[PDB]
Structure formats: C-alpha cells, structure tokens
C-alpha cells in the first residue's frame, strides 16, 4: 500500500479557465475554492470532437449570472462550467450522452460556498469560473440512455490531456 500525496496549488485560482476574461471578483458569495485534485466529472450532451478541441467554455463570462446560488437553483447563462465530485451523477441527467472525466486544478466548491442544505446539494458540484481548458479534460465515456450506464468499450481519451500531478 501507499498513501497519496497532497495536491499542487496554483497562484491563479482560475488557472484552468478556457475563457480567462472571467472576473473572479464578481463571484458571489465569497467562493470557497476546491483544494483537492481528484478526478471530477461532467455529464454533457456535447460530443468529444468539440470538447477535446475547445475544452468546456462557459456560456457568458461577460453578462452571465455570477451568483452561484442563483445559477444552481435557476438554470441561467453563467461564467461557470459545472462539474461534480460524483462519478455517477450522469445517471440523473437524462439525454446527457457523455460522462467526461476532468483533472483540473481549482474550481469553486459549491456546497462549501453556499452550504449543503440547498435543493441540489446532492450534486456535489464544483463550478469552474471561465470553464476548463482541454488540457485538463482526461477523456469521456458515452452513456447508454436506456440503462444509464457507461459504454466502457467506447470511452475515448483526450489527445490533449496534460497530466500535472
Ligand atoms: O451545462 C450547461 O451548459 C447548462 C445546462 C445544465 N447542465 C448541464 C450539464 C451538467 N452536467 C453536470 O455534470 C453537472 C454537474 C453538476 F454538479 C451540476 C450541474 C451539471 C450540469 C448542468
């Protein structure tokens, strides 16, 4: 056996951002940043040819909803890309055809920032302001809609993934 090491910590809290125009000072409430570095996940209907080329871009870093509680409760264009600590959350997202695997520094830990009592606390969300560059996307597994399971012989690694720890 061996114990795992601790995580590298970047000076820039949005080092991972695909759109660096995000304005960290506009995040509300005061963000509690994720300091661990385990694999995160994102269910997305968008296909890997697009995600591996572009990363995950946020819908609106200029005029989107910077309030985290508002964004979580009421789907609204935002500067954030949502991810989760829960490998299996894809099973709750109907028609989301893929489960993406993410190895990225930082992100706002939603439940640490807004509490763990809100309606969607069981999503155990990490919100990436400015999104996530492709170098931090490990790969993807497509999801069989009828059984809500991953089609593991059809997983694909991202050629642009750059391990960093
Ligand atoms: O995502 C958009 O662009 C807007 C539509 C809404 N989505 C799509 C997909 C998706 N995937 C996730 O894994 C996830 C994980 C979370 F913890 C919280 C939210 C999500 C969402 C929310």
TrEMBL record:
Annotated residues that bind NADH are located at: 42-43, 45, 57, 59, 71, 75, 125
Q: Which UniProt keywords apply?
A: Nucleotide-binding, Signal
Gene Ontology MF term list: nucleotide binding
**What intrachain disulfides are recorded?**
7-37, 141-155
Report if keyword Endoplasmic reticulum is assigned: no
Q: Which residues form the Pierisin-like domain?
A: 40-161
Respond yes or no to whether keyword Signal is given for this record: yes
Its recorded name reads Putative secreted protein
User: What organism, scientifically named, is this protein from?
Assistant: Streptomyces scabiei (strain 87.22)
